Amino acid sequence: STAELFRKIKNEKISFFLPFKCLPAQHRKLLFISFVCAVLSGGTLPFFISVFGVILKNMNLGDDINPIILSLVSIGLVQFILSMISSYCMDVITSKILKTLKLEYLRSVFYQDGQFHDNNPGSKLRSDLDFYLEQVSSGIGTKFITIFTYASSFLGLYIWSLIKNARLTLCITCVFPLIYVCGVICNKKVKLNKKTSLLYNNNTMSIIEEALMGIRTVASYCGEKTILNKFNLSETFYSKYILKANFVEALHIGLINGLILVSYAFGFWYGTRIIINSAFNGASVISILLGVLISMFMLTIILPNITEYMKALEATNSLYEIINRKPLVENNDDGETLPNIKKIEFKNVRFHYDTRKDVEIYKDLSFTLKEGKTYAFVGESGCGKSTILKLIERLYDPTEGDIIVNDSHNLKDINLKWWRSKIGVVSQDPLLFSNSIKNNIKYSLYSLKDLEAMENYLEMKKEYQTIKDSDVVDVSKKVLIHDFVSSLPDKYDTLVGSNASKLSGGQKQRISIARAIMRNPKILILDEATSSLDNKSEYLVQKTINNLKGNENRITIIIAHRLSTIRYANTIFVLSNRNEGSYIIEQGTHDSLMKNKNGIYHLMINNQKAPNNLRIIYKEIFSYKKDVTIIFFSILVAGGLYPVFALLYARYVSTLFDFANLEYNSNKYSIYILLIAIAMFISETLKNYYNNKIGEKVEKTMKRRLFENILYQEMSFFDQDKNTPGVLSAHINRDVHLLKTGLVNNIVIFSHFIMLFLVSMVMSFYFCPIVAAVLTFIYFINMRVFAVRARLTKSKEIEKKEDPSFLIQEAFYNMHTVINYGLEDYFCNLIEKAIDYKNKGQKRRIIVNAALWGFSQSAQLFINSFAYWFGSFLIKRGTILVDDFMKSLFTFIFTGSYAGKLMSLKGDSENAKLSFEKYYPLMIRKSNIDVRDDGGIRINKNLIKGKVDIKDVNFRYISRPNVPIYKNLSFTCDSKKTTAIVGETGSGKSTFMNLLLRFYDLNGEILLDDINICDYNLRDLRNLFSIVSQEPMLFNMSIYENIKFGREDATLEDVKRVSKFAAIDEFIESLPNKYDTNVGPYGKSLSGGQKQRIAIARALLREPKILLLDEATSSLDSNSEKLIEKTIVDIKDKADKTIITIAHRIASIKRSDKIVVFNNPDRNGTFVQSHGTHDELLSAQDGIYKKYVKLA
Ligand SMILES: O[C@H](c1cc(C(F)(F)F)nc2c(C(F)(F)F)cccc12)[C@@H]1CCCCN1
């Protein structure tokens, strides 16, 4: 509501002048012109309406109308022109301020403190800005000035009507407060139910996602239906509450079209009463009612524009605070500068992350750096040398340390600009621009050449070309890139690729090295200079760096990661942190640091050295007969009895200028209006409600089919990539709500529209055929051939989608490269390439789009005037009477207006019809693995031993049909004896389980009691197993139901019993709602041990004839570990249970009766190698069991 935001803004006092401040003084009054070019056009209707009654008095009495027509059309023309001016003004102003705020935002982005660069990652900002623009590019345009026109019209109409007659309109305007009251009272009761409706939807969302993620656990226990039931029981409440909301939503709508007619009737009635009591004519009564009515219409169209304007205001306040965010590390020029940089001293460098405020990395980084020295440094792959170079560059500052230089001055006194100026940097990867080869090289010295002109006298702009192509030649010859660049065509012309994508990487690193060399730093630094080079080119680069022109004044720090290239070094401060801070463990030269001791550096140098589909829907819709016929009848009644108002209004005008027999006529004609209103109420009520009552059922019978078919689909369908839970949950919600909102909201509208367009047109021919043909021709050539709004919105939206669309995107991925140089060189390379291409097309676009809007506001006036002229023309020569014309006219006009009114309620029809074909196969797609298909032998769960056998297997996934996984497996497990499996970790041990449970089918042969697997009625085959994953999963149901998952019929006492083996049934008796406390989503409200014990209890409740473990106690404490192992051995002691395990401790393997082993000689599969160690013969020959006892 507007009052909400008004009370909000009342206290902070945002300036309503705020968007209009990035403007010169010239645009202060080009704006002001449009103030007066949009108040005059509000004083138009008070003239038309004030002559409206006089025209009718003048036509049905004999006299002529010609002066008033010419008095009117001139005002129409000046309205056209005054409407044409304002568009051209306002759009230009908006484009200007829109450009300028963007160009301020880019600058403010380039002045973040380094920490903020890490806080908000990159392209998010690029995705934010544009969004805010489309909240303000189309929210302060012409639809701001449309306020004042309507306000002026309101004031003029009401006050003129009041001075002409006051008691009448006072007696009329006493019904509209009751509309506002009903509106708020209905809005309350709508929100109160809508929020509960929303509340009962996220539950279903969770039930879908959490169930699709952990899919195979559902298939193993066969717990499909106990999710469907919860889904339906949560869906029904949503349906009923949203229908209760739609009822009140439709009642108010159907009501507002009922009181306006009472207003008309009482108005005319009291008018005739005062006319009779007079002894003020009748021409002064037709206008008062229309004035008071269209006056209070403008208060329904002003407010959305105010909302959008406040929205633009808050959007701009959400951006100027970004532009007014100050960094801590400023690139000012207030800092001083030494003659040259001497003796950069470090001492106790301390710093923590501003995000994580309890983690330190450095303690005592401290050493000296003075000109004329050579060095060599190396760090581990987790040091944070990035932090070191960032602090050299001053992206951050320490917390306790110091950057003392020359033992007299800290870095804070030194100019950051001068500091980065005299530092050549090279980084890890070649992520460079796409301008050209040389332009990455000659633009560097700008960072210094600005100083030639900034402190001297803009001469900076002209000295760009002054740096010629001289140094590229020699700096290319040095790094040996001269050979290649002089070989391929377009030597210094073929640009470095799009975001550095065309040429080789190491050669782009040579370009970076040339940048560092050419910019003439007093301190030339390199970091990861030679990270991934070959031998000879690296050595030549080394020879280039250590012996540049005049190496007596420089500090040639180098950080390589190959240890055969740290040969020369005045000192090698290699460090370690073994964790609250590093410290330099190693100190010395290359020769006196490897042979020093058997230390860390010693180890380092040692190691390296079609239409059917939709008539499905229509078939579904053509079965609920009790709700189709009612909608049909309401459509008939509305379409039939709205036009009757027109020719009941005409007869009431023609009978007004007859002083005789007036009382009876009034008493007879007002009552029909009353009755028609009482019918229209009920019609619009029962029309806008069963629409949604039919919309609901199609959704909640399609969602059922989808979510019921998806569960039974085989596992290979889920193994694919596109079959992701996110997209599959996105479909079921979005496209189904579109099938509701899109389709049935565009089958009723067409029917009602066609009903009106037939009945009104036909019984408009019958009274005056000569006028109707003209009118239809006019509106035909106007709408379907000169669609002003269509062409306007098209020409808008095409060019509103939008080389400023190319440089901006690639200028953020290289945000670390722009800091090497280039801060304003691309502040002033986008202004040009914007302004050059805006205006040249903008002129034509805006002049056309302003003329087309100025035409649209003053078209009905000319048509109406022409109609009145053509009507009073024929009547003079005695061809048609007056009443027939009035009847043929009012019906057409009012019905056209109403038909255009309700037409603007459609929804998205095409995209829903499109998506229905996307997801139609899924509710019908064949899976060829169905738990329901029960053709096969039943597994009676009493005659079972558990003898598994493997004849031969050669299996491979379809995800890659190139990697063999099994090379002729063969082993057995006889009866009620453990068979442990010890092998290489990651060799694919936990895959045979999936084969056994028919998650995949067969290039291999598995037997159960010497019987094939495909003849078992697999529901029962999954009824006598129980697995244990690495981590179980706990759904959002109760602990009672989590344990009872799979088997619905079970007592709480049995749960208390089987919960004893897991030894967890004491913690549960430590809090209220013991077997009722609902765990959180994904089991995030409990521990890991509790989770596994609950999973074990769930597996044991079923009385599983065969057990299948996997990674028993990978992370549990010894207590729960030995309790579990106690359960294992105790349950092995009894018969009637064959167990198979995959352990990682001899503590359990000692009880193994046969220990089968898998090996991986070469990466092409596995096969059995060992059998029968049974803890006695650990290695009579070679094996891995010896390894897994001597390591254990
Ligand atoms: O049919 C009515 C209508 C009124 C007026 C008014 F009298 F205010 F100048 N002008 C309309 C115009 C006009 F072009 F502005 F004259 C076009 C279509 C409908 C108009 C309104 C339009 C908005 C939806 C309700 N009917």
From its phi and psi, is residue 62 left (phi > 0), alpha (psi between -120 and 50) or beta? left
Coil vs helix vs strand at 978: coil
Alpha-carbon distance of 573 to 592, in angstroms, equals: 13
* Residue 1164: burial class (beta carbons within 10 Å; 0-12, 13-18, 19+): exposed
Q: How far is the CA of 786 from the centre of ligand 1 (A)?
A: 18
Half-sphere exposure of 954 (CA within 13 A, CB side): 7
> Resolution of this entry in Å?
3.5
Q: How far is the CA of 754 from the centre of ligand 1 (A)?
A: 21
The first and second tokens of residue 835, run together, are 């302004």
Quick check: CB of 300 below 6 Å from ligand 1?
A: no
Q: Which residue has the tokens 């404490």?
A: 1117
Nearest CA-CA partner of 425 in 516, 561, 542? 516
The first and second tokens of residue 72, run together, are 């009117």
Nearest CA-CA partner of 600 in 347, 385, 379? 379
Q: How far is the CA of 897 from the centre of ligand 1 (A)?
A: 7
Q: How far is the CA of 901 from the centre of ligand 1 (A)?
A: 10
Nearest atom of ligand 1 to the alpha carbon of 153:
8
Number of H helices, E strands in the chain: 47, 12
Protein residue whose Cα sits closest to atom 1 of ligand 1:
897
Cβ(703)–Cβ(626) under 8 Å?
A: no
Instruction: Tell me the residue type at 729.
Output: S
Nearest CA-CA partner of 1171 in 1005, 988, 970? 970
Burial 897-917 (b: 16+ CB within 10 A, else e): ebbeeeeeeebebeebbebbe
Nearest CA-CA partner of 1128 in 1117, 1115, 1142? 1142
* Best mutation site among 47, 158, 860, 866 for ligand 1 pocket (most ligand atoms within 8 Å of CB): 860
C-alpha distances out from residue 683 to 262, 511, 677, 695, 1087, Å:
16, 78, 10, 19, 61
Protein residue whose Cα sits closest to atom 14 of ligand 1:
860
Cβ(625)–Cβ(694) under 8 Å?
A: no
Alpha-carbon distance of 89 to 617, in angstroms, equals: 51
The first and second tokens of residue 612, run together, are 């059917």
Q: How far is the CA of 273 from the centre of ligand 1 (A)?
A: 31
What H or E segment, with its residue span, contains residue 1006? strand 1004-1008
Residue 780 neighbours by CB under 8 Å, 6+ apart: none
Q: Which residue has the tokens 């690296």?
A: 538
Q: How far is the CA of 497 from the centre of ligand 1 (A)?
A: 57
Protein residue whose Cα sits closest to atom 16 of ligand 1:
860
Cβ(391)–Cβ(312) under 8 Å?
A: no
C-alpha distances out from residue 298 to 143, 289, 293, 302, Å:
14, 15, 9, 6
**What structural domains and CATH numbers belong to the chain?**
1-165+301-326+824-872 (no CATH), 373-607 (3.40.50.300), 940-1023+1145-1192 (3.40.50.300)
Cβ(435)–Cβ(496) under 8 Å?
A: yes
Residue 558 neighbours by CB under 8 Å, 6+ apart: 375, 376, 377, 526, 529, 530, 542, 545
Instruction: Tell me the residue type at 356.
Output: R
Quick check: CB of 619 below 6 Å from ligand 1?
A: no
Protein residue whose Cα sits closest to atom 26 of ligand 1:
897
Quick check: CB of 779 below 6 Å from ligand 1?
A: no
Torsion sign across C-alpha atoms 868, 874, 876, 879: negative
Helix axes 663-687, 690-709, angle to 10 degrees: 10
Q: How far is the CA of 249 from the centre of ligand 1 (A)?
A: 25
Coil vs helix vs strand at 326: coil
Quick check: CB of 294 below 6 Å from ligand 1?
A: yes
Quick check: CB of 801 below 6 Å from ligand 1?
A: no
Residue 199 neighbours by CB under 8 Å, 6+ apart: none
C-alpha distances out from residue 803 to 129, 795, 807, 831, Å:
18, 21, 6, 10
DSSP letter (8 states) at residue 806: T
Alpha-carbon distance of 244 to 242, in angstroms, equals: 5
The experimental method behind these coordinates is cryo-EM
Cα–chain center distance at 309: 24
Quick check: CB of 613 below 6 Å from ligand 1?
A: no
Q: How far is the CA of 405 from the centre of ligand 1 (A)?
A: 77
Alpha-carbon distance of 330 to 354, in angstroms, equals: 18
Cβ(460)–Cβ(454) under 8 Å?
A: yes
Three-state DSSP string of 129-183: HHHHHHHHCCCCCHHHHHHHHHHHHHHHHHHHHHHHCCHHHHHHCCCCHHHHHHH
Bridge partner residues of 1159 (DSSP): 1167
Q: How far is the CA of 165 from the centre of ligand 1 (A)?
A: 25
Residue list, annotated binding site for ATP: 353, 355-356, 381, 383-387, 428, 502, 504, 506-507, 957, 960, 985-986, 988-991, 1030, 1086-1087, 1089-1090
DSSP letter (8 states) at residue 829: T
Nearest atom of ligand 1 to the alpha carbon of 900:
24
Nearest atom of ligand 1 to the alpha carbon of 298:
8
Beta strand pairing call for 555-556 and 373-374: parallel
Alpha-carbon distance of 364 to 346, in angstroms, equals: 9
Coil vs helix vs strand at 405: strand
**Strand ranges across the sheet with 972-973:** 972-973, 948-953, 1004-1008
